Design a protein around this nucleic acid. Structure first.
Ligand SMILES: [Mg+2]
Ligand SMILES: [Zn+2]
Ligand SMILES: [Zn+2]
Ligand SMILES: [Zn+2]
Lengths: 441, 56, 112, 164, 97, 111, 497, 147
RNA sequence: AUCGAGAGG
DNA sequence: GGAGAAGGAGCAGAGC
DNA sequence: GCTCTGCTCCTTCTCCTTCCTCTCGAT
């Protein structure tokens, strides 16, 4: 797991939004007709050194676990990243053309990158970045290490700490189950979905079957991202481009002879007679979701943006969703109905195959990611304010370099993986001191 | 006698590992027992898990 | 019945039997499980449930309610439990362990 | 458990490419009632499309995983009753190594693919202090089965003795 | 060692009244405090060298009494006073029955 | 921590005589003797020989607690046979038999 | 020295603004702490303005007494504005929902049989509840109230005549909704605005004694008006220990820091309103004061805004200081740590009598008993003194009639000290002493029993097998507690009960 | 051996049955920031030390440390750390005489009793002297030990 | 001094 | 988790 | 006859806890 992180994920976290911009295109500067100036930073390849000592006198040493343990040091390596400083000098060329970034590109001063220090990274022993990963038994004796020590842990301030795998529910799955009779919902499909491509999202679609079949269960509604109120699936489909009846059921019921499912679906279509215009459906969604802004379109585009980017986030950036996403939506609805129709039983919420374990890789990935973002956010505002970032970036980065190092260390050191504010999603116990009574302990 | 009775009743309750079954009876004894039932009694629950009415 | 067969045919020399007869640690079921059939394992008052689709383990075919497939242990502790019996027994043991924890929280509060 | 392992996950693209290569039809072209018996193919929760001969598809997909073309950790579950095929490349999945049973052995009835010679060569290597665990995977002798895939698996206990 | 709630409950069941007094006050927490007879608050300025007292606010330089009470209980009462709540300790039961 | 001194298993301490003879009140011609720093390695011999004396009505012993190397001996005899002397006789008897044991072993060994 | 008495009654009530100042011995005027900022002192108006003393200092209302027998003293804070007591905001709301509003009289009266039934209730806590229930409806301060006999005759008691606004709770503020809303076009729809604390305070002052009693209260010990804070009391150092963090540092109790924050908020108003007033913007400072005062008493009132201490944690309010498990009542009062006790592992010992217990010499040496020197035991006690504090039949501190404690660990007079009758000798535990022995958790009487001590070697408690049945004990590592009696009365009590 | 209690062969214990060796480590750091006050390690003196502990320092060497092999028991001091008198407002040093040498030493835990095994003297990444002491003692099965 | 974690009964 | 307390709402009767 | 003046009849919200003991390791 740890190797997977440093081999790929670490680079990918940096790669995502690796650049920072500052397009101060046609602004004011009375001396010209809206002056144009631009700046841009570009992070590239990361380099990971071997565990290194940073002495108070500036001298560095190859850090060997044993010394780290004896001198209360943290067994971390140096992180260096390609950082390009693209300075686009104010061109001062009065005119409409100053509104383009292209004319700004013409004054680009591409300052070199190289190994720019970003921070330190705690190295798991016997990992690809650890000396002991290649050391032979004889060498281990020379280094006064134990030939039986598996090394699956970190050394922080000399303390041997280990990340404990944490169990969680798998994302992008369909959880159909019965809702308590004390509620107004009979059946519900809890759709946990997360676009784990960087931004994560982690949203939940609630497809609800309201009460009993002789009552409100006749119409199914769903809870959409940000939308405060529940919205009839028949409206959602129309909003997704599926107006025509029959077709709207074609995406749900996959059997023309299943009159029982069709029976339950019928009333939904009945409610669908209220809105026949896709634009109206989108309007309905937007104005139902929140305060009626975007009055120019009554939040039609707003609703579209939610459906495009938030609704079922694991399938996005694709206009083909009008069919593809519609199929997935109706699929989930179909399964919900199968449960209600006694075609399939309740999903087992304790099934181990539906669970996932977060290991050092995935754990550090989440932790580091937020630390990396903190770094780029601070720099970003300093670049905006500073008159020529080229003379400030060099220092502000270093300040945030310390931030990541100490933030990353702290979280691992205490096990408190919050923001040091108020147990922000605390996971105290995620990082524990290894038990050292027996080899087996 | 207050505390004494409280302890007398509270103590042996720790031996009730039956919960709902393992006591047997004449009719289909699906009757809440052990600690779960004790809680219903002491709380005076308005919605007991097992009502059951005996008619002679 | 199996337990009684074992019990009846124990000699008075039998040390376990003597402790049971004295009433100092031990009971009929303890003898029955050590010497004869351990018995049907149970979870929440039921036989081992189908945690897999229509079956209790991946070692059984689907739709099979034959005693041992749902926790019946034919072997004694003396004889030893077979992998499946072992696991099913472990499942029963687990809920037992759980209840011994919960009941202390519950009765502790009640007592107070 | 002693031999329990956790997946580090990978990129599902290669597989998606294979799926289309082997006739998996995109949902934009999917017409339920036209092909009501098509198998719904999902990768990591994403419904990519459907297929009209999932049996042959699995024959190939399993072969690829066994060959090493598809990273051994990738899980593949064919649901014969609900007409679905799920493939997972997601990290964090827990899986166990099992012997592959191959009744193709015409020498008799159903029998293990792993033969004594593999053990002889393996042991030999174990005492040369070339076979290794990864070579057992490369030869397609054992598989990584996670809790989810087990739903479609029938596992023998002791092959030496082994109603099914 | 903590003499817990359950431990004092059992002494009650035993009827060991003086034992509890000893273990709950003599074995830890004990404080002599002067209480104003008019208003049962701990505001008496015990000038223990001139035998001067004075409640102040009640101008009571005569009718006061000494209470032997657990220090923790003193804190409770002062912490109640901190919330604008009086706990007036009287040594003469006015509510006969 | 608070473990006892192993010297206390056989060495007499301050104010500790080897023997203390008390008179019983539950029966006539009966005494109870306390052996300090002495367990039944010796004690069992004493009882055994006392029970070989037809003028002894009672002979028994007990170690009240294993934490202490002490041994209680109770002797009851017939009228006139002072139990104290009965014990003295038992000791003489035991020694004489041990003397022969040694002699017979040494001879058997040499041969 | 005043006469010794016992507490027979506890009368609860609320402090009267004036009363607070009457007992207060400090004006309190500086939002600053220890040393007045580098003066090696305290604060002229905080911490030590004749209040609770600190290490090596006396004063404390000129009574000195060091920090031993010297309870602290309360100061006070004159608040710029009236502040709702966080614990009475619900009651204040309900009271305002019963009184006619700016009248001082209840909405209902005798002229109403349903009200008469409520008024007939003796249980005050149920009475005002019944009154409030009825007063939830018809919230109009009708001047002329229809007589129960010949309704055309009415009683002109409603001093206002207007409607009584309803009240909505909004955090630490109450929102008034002045019914109005005339049917003729919904004129003046229920005017909404936050009710001023001062308005309510004045109303509470208007409420008559008859109305006090009607809603409970007590014109001597509790008035509606006293639910609004106008003058805080300031807890002394004994209550809010200044602490000596690490080496000569501070780290004063949360209350000290929080009280300073209150002073700052109060002063903000003091100068803001007085000098450069910014009209409605003053309310922000009023809200600030309200917030700090309410939270110092209770750091948790639904509204997400929980007060945090600059260190990155919640402020430990007074409520937090004395609530739930491990909080005064249940923590330090109902149960507590005690001296003259021991704990260790038990082991079986079939050679002990049912009522005996084997106690390790190291424990018998540690724990003591204050035996009184009399003509019947002075021989033994003088020997124990000579034995010293290094024998399991020894002794420790010797108490003279003067109260002097002779530490035998620092004495070369083991054979010189002559005990006098009336002295006490804190001897080591002897055999046959009565001690209380128990096992946790204690579920019944049987878990607490008195045993006769037997001093033994080694380091475990020894028990007769048969006594473990009631203790529910075993010998797989169980631990038991000893509680050793000090008075003769308690020894007898245990041995006989 | 009445319950879960057991009878163990004392002769076997004497020979070495279940005998074990116990280690414990102590440590301390040089100082913080030299703002008119610095901290160090040095053997203290009863008359030339302020707020001295009630143990002993006569087992310490020149730098307040104990060489390996020395038997150290109970309250005996093992690290003679010193920290100048701080009677002033700034909590720093002060112009005093005998009491200027205020200590801040570390002893063994009151229940410990063994000999010094190994003493380590290093510096952290901040260049601050760091003392770490390992001590050891033999644990011989008692009647209260669990097996 | 709080705070979490690991255990024991 | 399962109370309890506070609030909106939906109809038999009832006076103009 | 028809709105009106009450209800009482519901639904929709806020609040709380075995014992006890040990150690370390962070701020
Ligand atoms: Mg036990
Ligand atoms: Zn007074
Ligand atoms: Zn004073
Ligand atoms: Zn009014």
């Amino acid at each position: 797991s740890f190797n997977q992180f440093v081999d790929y994920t670490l680079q990918d976290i940096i790669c995502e939004d690796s650049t920072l911009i500052l397009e101060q295109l046609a602004q004011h500067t009375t001396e010209s007709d809206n002056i144009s100036r631009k700046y841009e930073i570009s992070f590239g390849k990361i380099y990971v050194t071997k565990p290194m000592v940073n002495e108070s006198d500036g001298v560095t040493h190859a850090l060997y676990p044993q010394e780290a343990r004896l001198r209360n040091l943290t067994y971390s390596s140096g992180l260096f990243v390609d950082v390009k400083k693209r300075t686009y000098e104010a061109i001062d060329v009065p005119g409409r053309e100053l509104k383009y970034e292209l004319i700004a590109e013409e004054s680009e001063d591409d300052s070199e990158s190289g190994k720019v220090f970003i921070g330190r990274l705690p190295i798991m022993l016997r990992s690809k970045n650890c000396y002991l990963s290649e050391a032979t038994e004889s060498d281990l004796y020379k280094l006064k290490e134990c030939p039986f020590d598996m090394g699956g842990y970190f050394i922080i301030n000399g303390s041997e700490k280990v990340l404990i795998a944490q169990e969680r529910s798998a994302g992008n799955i369909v959880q159909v189950f019965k809702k308590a009779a004390p509620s107004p919902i009979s059946h519900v499909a809890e759709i946990r979905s997360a676009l784990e491509k960087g931004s994560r999202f982690i949203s939940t679609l609630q497809v609800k079957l309201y009460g009993r079949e002789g009552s409100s269960a006749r119409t199914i509604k769903a809870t959409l991202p940000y939308i405060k109120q529940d919205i009839p699936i028949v409206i959602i489909f129309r909003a997704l481009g599926i107006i025509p009846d029959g077709e709207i059921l074609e995406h749900i019921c996959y059997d023309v002879n299943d009159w029982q499912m069709l029976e339950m679906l019928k009333p939904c279509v009945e409610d669908g007679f209220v809105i026949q215009d896709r634009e109206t459906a989108l309007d309905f969604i937007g104005r139902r979701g929140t305060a009626l802004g975007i009055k120019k379109e009554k939040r039609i585009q707003y609703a579209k943006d939610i459906l495009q980017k938030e609704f079922l986030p694991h399938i996005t950036q694709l206009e083909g969703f009008e069919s593809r996403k519609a199929f997935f939506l109706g699929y989930m609805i179909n399964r919900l109905l199968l449960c209600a129709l006694d075609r399939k039983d309740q999903d087992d919420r304790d099934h181990f195959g539906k669970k996932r374990l977060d290991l050092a890789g995935p754990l550090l990935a989440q932790l580091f990611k937020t630390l990396f973002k903190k770094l780029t956010k601070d720099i970003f505002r300093y670049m905006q304010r500073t008159v020529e970032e080229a003379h400030d970036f060099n220092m502000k980065l270093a300040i945030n370099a310390k931030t990541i190092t100490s933030g990353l260390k702290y979280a691992l050191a205490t096990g408190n993986w919050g923001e040091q504010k108020k147990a922000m999603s605390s996971r105290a116990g995620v990082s524990q001191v290894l038990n050292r009574y027996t080899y087996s302990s | 006698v207050g505390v004494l009775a409280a302890q007398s009743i509270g103590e042996p309750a720790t031996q009730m590992t039956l919960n709902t079954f393992h006591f047997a009876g004449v009719a289909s004894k699906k009757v809440t027992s052990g600690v779960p039932r004790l809680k219903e009694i002491l709380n005076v629950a308005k919605n007991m898990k097992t009502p059951s009415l005996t008619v002679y | 019945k199996a337990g009684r067969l074992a019990e009846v045919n124990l000699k008075d020399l039998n040390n376990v039997k003597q402790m049971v007869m004295a009433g100092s640690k031990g009971s009929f079921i303890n003898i029955a499980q050590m010497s004869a059939c351990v018995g049907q394992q149970s979870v929440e008052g039921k036989r081992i449930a189908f945690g897999f689709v229509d079956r209790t383990l991946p070692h059984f075919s689907k739709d099979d309610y034959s005693p041992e497939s749902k926790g019946f242990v034919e072997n004694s502790y003396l004889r030893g439990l077979t992998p499946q019996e072992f696991f099913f027994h472990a499942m029963g043991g687990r809920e037992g362990l759980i209840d011994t924890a919960v009941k202390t929280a519950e009765t502790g509060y009640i007592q107070r | 458990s002693l031999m329990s392992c956790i997946s580090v996950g990978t990129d599902p693209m290669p597989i998606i490419t294979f799926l289309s290569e082997w006739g998996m039809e995109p949902l934009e072209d999917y017409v339920p009632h036209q092909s009501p018996d098509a198998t719904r193919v999902f990768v990591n929760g994403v419904w990519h499309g459907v297929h009209r001969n999932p049996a042959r598809l699995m024959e190939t997909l399993r072969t690829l995983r066994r060959k090493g073309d598809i990273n051994p950790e990738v899980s593949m579950i064919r649901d014969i009753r609900e007409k679905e095929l799920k493939i997972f490349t997601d990290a964090g999945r827990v899986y166990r190594p099992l012997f592959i049973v191959e009744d193709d052995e015409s020498l008799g009835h159903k029998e293990l693919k792993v033969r004594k010679g593999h053990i002889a060569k393996l042991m030999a290597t174990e005492y040369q202090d070339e076979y290794t665990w990864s070579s057992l995977l490369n030869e397609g002798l054992v598989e990584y089965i996670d809790a989810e895939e087990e739903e479609s698996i029938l596992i023998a206990m002791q092959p030496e003795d082994l109603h099914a | 060692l903590r003499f817990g709630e359950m431990e004092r409950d059992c002494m009650i069941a035993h009827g060991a009244a003086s034992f509890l007094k000893e273990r709950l006050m003599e074995a830890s927490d004990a404080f002599r405090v002067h209480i104003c007879g008019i208003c049962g608050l701990m505001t008496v300025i015990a000038k223990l060298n001139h035998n001067q007292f004075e409640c102040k606010g009640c101008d009571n330089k005569i009718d006061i009494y000494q209470i032997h009470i657990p220090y923790a209980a003193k804190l409770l009462f002062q912490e109640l006073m901190a919330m604008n709540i009086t706990p007036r300790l009287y040594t003469d039961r006015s509510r006969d029955f | 921590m608070n473990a006892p001194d192993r010297f206390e298993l056989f060495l007499l301490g301050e104010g500790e005589s080897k023997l203390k003879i008390d008179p019983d009140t539950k029966a006539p011609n009966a005494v109870v003797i306390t052996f300090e720093k002495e367990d039944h390695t010796l004690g069992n011999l004493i009882r055994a020989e006392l029970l070989n004396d037809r003028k002894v009505l009672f002979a028994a012993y007990k170690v009240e607690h294993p934490f202490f190397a002490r041994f209680k001996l109770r002797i009851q005899t017939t009228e006139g046979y002072d139990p104290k002397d009965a014990l003295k006789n038992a000791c003489n008897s035991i020694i004489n038999k041990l003397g022969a044991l040694k002699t017979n072993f040494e001879t058997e060994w040499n041969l | 020295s005043a006469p010794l008495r016992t507490v027979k009654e506890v009368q609860f009530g609320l402090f009267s603004p004036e009363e607070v100042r009457a007992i207060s011995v400090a004006k309190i005027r500086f939002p600053e702490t220890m040393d007045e900022t580098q003066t090696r002192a305290k604060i002229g108006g905080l911490n030590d303005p004749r209040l609770g003393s600190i290490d090596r200092n006396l004063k404390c209302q000129t009574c000195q007494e060091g920090m031993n027998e010297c309870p602290g003293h309360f100061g006070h804070i004159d608040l710029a504005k009236p502040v709702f007591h966080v614990g009475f905001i619900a009651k204040i709301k309900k009271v305002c929902e019963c009184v006619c509003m700016h009248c001082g009289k209840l909405l209902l009266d005798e002229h109403n049989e349903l009200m008469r039934q409520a008024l007939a209730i003796k249980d005050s806590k149920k009475r005002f509840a019944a009154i409030w229930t009825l007063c939830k409806t018809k919230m109009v301060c009708e001047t002329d109230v229809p007589s129960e006999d010949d309704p055309t005759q009415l009683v002109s008691r409603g001093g206002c005549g207007n409607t009584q606004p309803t009240i909505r709770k909004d955090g630490l503020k109450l929102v008034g909704s002045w019914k109005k809303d005339r049917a003729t076009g919904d004129a003046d729809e229920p005017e909404l605005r936050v009710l001023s604390t001062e308005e309510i305070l004045n109303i509470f002052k208007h409420i008559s004694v008859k109305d006090f009693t009607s809603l409970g209260f007590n014109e001597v010990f509790s008035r509606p008006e006293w639910m609004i804070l106008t003058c805080l009391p300031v807890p002394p150092p004994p209550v809010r220990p200044s602490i000596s963090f690490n080496e000569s540092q501070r780290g004063e109790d949360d209350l000290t820091f929080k009280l300073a924050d209150i002073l700052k908020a109060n002063i903000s108003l003091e100068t803001l309103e007085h000098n450069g007033a910014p009209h409605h913007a003053i309310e922000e400072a009023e809200s600030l004061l309200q917030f700090h005062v309410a939270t110092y008493m209770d750091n948790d009132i639904a509204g997400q805004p929980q007060a945090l201490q600059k260190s990155g944690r919640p402020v430990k309010s007074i409520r937090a200081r004395l609530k739930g498990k491990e909080g005064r009542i249940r923590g330090n009062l109902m149960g507590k740590r005690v001296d003259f006790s021991a704990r260790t592992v038990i082991s079986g010992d079939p050679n002990l009598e049912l009522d005996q217990v084997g106690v390790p010499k190291s424990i018998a040496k540690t724990l003591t008993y204050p035996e009184v020197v009399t003509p019947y035991n002075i021989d033994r006690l003088t020997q124990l003194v000579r034995n010293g504090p290094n024998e399991h039949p020894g002794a420790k501190y010797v108490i003279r009639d003067s109260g002097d404690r002779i530490d035998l660990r620092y004495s070369k007079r083991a054979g010189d000290i002559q005990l006098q009758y009336g002295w006490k000798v804190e001897r080591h535990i002897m055999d046959n002493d009565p001690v209380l022995f128990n096992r946790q958790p204690s579920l019944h009487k049987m878990s607490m029993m008195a045993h006769r001590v037997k001093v033994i070697p080694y380091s475990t408690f020894r028990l007769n097998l048969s006594v473990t049945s009631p203790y529910n004990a075993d010998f797989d590592g169980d631990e038991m507690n000893l509680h050793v009696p000090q008075s003769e009365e308690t020894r007898a009590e245990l041995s006989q009960l | 051996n009445q319950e879960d209690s057991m009878i163990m062969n004392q002769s076997s214990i004497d020979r070495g049955l279940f005998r074990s060796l116990f280690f414990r480590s102590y440590m301390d750091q040089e100082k913080k920031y030299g703002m008119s006050i610095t901290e160090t390690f040095e053997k203290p003196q009863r008359t030339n030390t302020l707020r001295m502990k009630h143990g002993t320092y006569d087992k310490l060497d020149d730098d307040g440390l104990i060489a390996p092999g020395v038997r150290v028991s109970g309250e005996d001091v093992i690290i003679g750390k010193t920290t100048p008198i701080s009677p002033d407002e700034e909590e720093l040093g002060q112009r005093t005489a005998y009491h200027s040498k205020r200590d801040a030493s570390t002893p063994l835990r009151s229940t410990e009793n063994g000999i010094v095994d190994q003493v380590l003297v290093t510096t952290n990444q901040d260049g601050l002297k760091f003392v770490k002491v390992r001590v050891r003692t033999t644990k011989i099965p008692q009647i209260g030990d669990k097996f």
